[PDB]
Amino acid sequence: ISEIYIVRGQKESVLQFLRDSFPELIVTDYASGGLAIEGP
Amino acid sequence: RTSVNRAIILLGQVDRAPEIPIVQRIYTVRGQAADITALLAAQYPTLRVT
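Structure tokens for the assembled complex are given below, as produced in the milestone run.
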């Protein structure tokens, strides 16, 4: 499923962390639109 | 039929109308002040006279 997480704080924080603890996920970035987390 | 719904929700964020820089001025009413408050609340009904 794909959901949208609007970045609240810093950008790379929600970027760098999210790949580490969740490599089984993909974040589709929408420039200034936030994120589009999808996967399992 | 699904990518549209996802595009619209996204599109609201990326597309916003230009904002209006609300300015402040202080008026020193000459005459009554209750009547010139009611005037500015019928004329120009979005001025925020405090």
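The CA atoms of residues 14 and 27 of chain B lie 39 Å apart. Chain B is about 40% helix and 0% strand. Further analysis is deferred to the final report.
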